[PDB]
Design a protein around this ligand. Sequence first.
Ligand SMILES: [Cl-]
Length: 162
Amino acid sequence: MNIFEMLRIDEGLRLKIYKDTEGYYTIGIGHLLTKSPSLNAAKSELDKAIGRNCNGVITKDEAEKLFNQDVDAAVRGILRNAKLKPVYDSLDAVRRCAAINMVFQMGETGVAGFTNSLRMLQQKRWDEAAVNLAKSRWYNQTPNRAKRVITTFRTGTWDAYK
Ligand SMILES: [Cl-]
């Protein structure tokens, strides 16, 4: 397993614009287009991102390139963030995937709000961090996704995805 396979399982793949769990226009492998309610705004963001007139539909190859760019951006955001980088650098490779997964879903600023959980992860207090991570709007709104990510942090294995 690697980060790309993990996020593909969690996000799925759709080649036409869809709405995510919060109602936001999305395409591909979980690529957020806009939080605006305007479908026309979402279509314009899509054309800008892809470089052609898509009319709301992309190819599998385009979805995979957007996805690679999004994962790279998530990693780079962690490495540039003074609060996230020291935690990330303290984690083993499997747990680093769980960290990227959270940033991909909620953004750099959303994860940075998990201050208490991040300190427990840095201290390798896995069971305590798992309980603390579950006491969140994240867990209450997307519990199956959150359970898989939390189990990955807790165990350092891919067992939740196998
Ligand atoms: Cl879920």
